[PDB]
Amino acid sequence: GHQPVAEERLSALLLNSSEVNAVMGSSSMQPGKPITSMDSSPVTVSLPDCQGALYTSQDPVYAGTGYTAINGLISSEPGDNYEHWVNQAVVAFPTADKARAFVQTSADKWKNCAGKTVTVTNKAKTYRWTFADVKGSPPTITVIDTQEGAEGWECQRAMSVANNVVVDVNACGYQITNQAGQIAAKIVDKVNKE
Ligand SMILES: [Tb+3]
Numbered sequence: 338g339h340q341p342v343a344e345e346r347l348s349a350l351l352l353n354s355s356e357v358n359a360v361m362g363s364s365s366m367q368p369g370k371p372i373t374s375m376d377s378s379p380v381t382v383s384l385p386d387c388q389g390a391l392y393t394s395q396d397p398v399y400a401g402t403g404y405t406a407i408n409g410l411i412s413s414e415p416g417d418n419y420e421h422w423v424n425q426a427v428v429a430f431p432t433a434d435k436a437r438a439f440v441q442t443s444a445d446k447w448k449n450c451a452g453k454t455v456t457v458t459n460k461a462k463t464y465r466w467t468f469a470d471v472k473g474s475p476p477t478i479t480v481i482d483t484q485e486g487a488e489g490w491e492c493q494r495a496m497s498v499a500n501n502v503v504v505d506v507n508a509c510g511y512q513i514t515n516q517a518g519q520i521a522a523k524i525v526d527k528v529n530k531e
Pocket residue numbers: 376378
């Protein structure tokens with residue numbers, strides 16, 4: 338079987354509520370409404386090409402890449418002070434080649450963000466985030482970013498590709514090590530079984 342994943346099957350690739358909870362160490366995370374388009378809400382990053390290194394599914398990042406469809410979910414415990422937060426998305430491309438090219442581009446951009454602090458402005462609010470080094474083994478990339486302050490809030494970004502599908506994950510919390518890497522690998526397993 339060498340057929341690509343159909344656009345209409347993207348939602349079946351995401352992790353369910355049990356799976357998200359299990360990775361994150363929670364029993365109460367809940368998903369929001371399906372996300373079915375790229376995010377074009379404005380955000381300013383002091384190094385503009387680090388936008389994708391901070392957030393999944395960003396319009397300025399995916400624009401022009403040939404993607405055909407995106408399906409995602411954001412999950413967290415209820416309330417304003419959730420312990421865990423996950424944004425998981427899968428992005429369909431016409432071919433494996435185009436999907437892989439996008440991850441390669443992402444790897445180039447993330448490597449220029451590694452080991453740097455950037456300033457991010459959103460809704461007239463400004464915060465600084467510090468990137469660790471880019472990790473992972475082909476075709477997966479990961480990087481941990483840490484929000485300034487004594488909270489210790491952090492996010493791990495993970496991106497991978499299988500078949501014609503790019504897997505794009507942001508997992509955040511106070512005890513981040515490789516949750517986004519785990520999520521990505523589980524989504525890749527779902528792509529593989531399509
Ligand atoms: Tb957003």
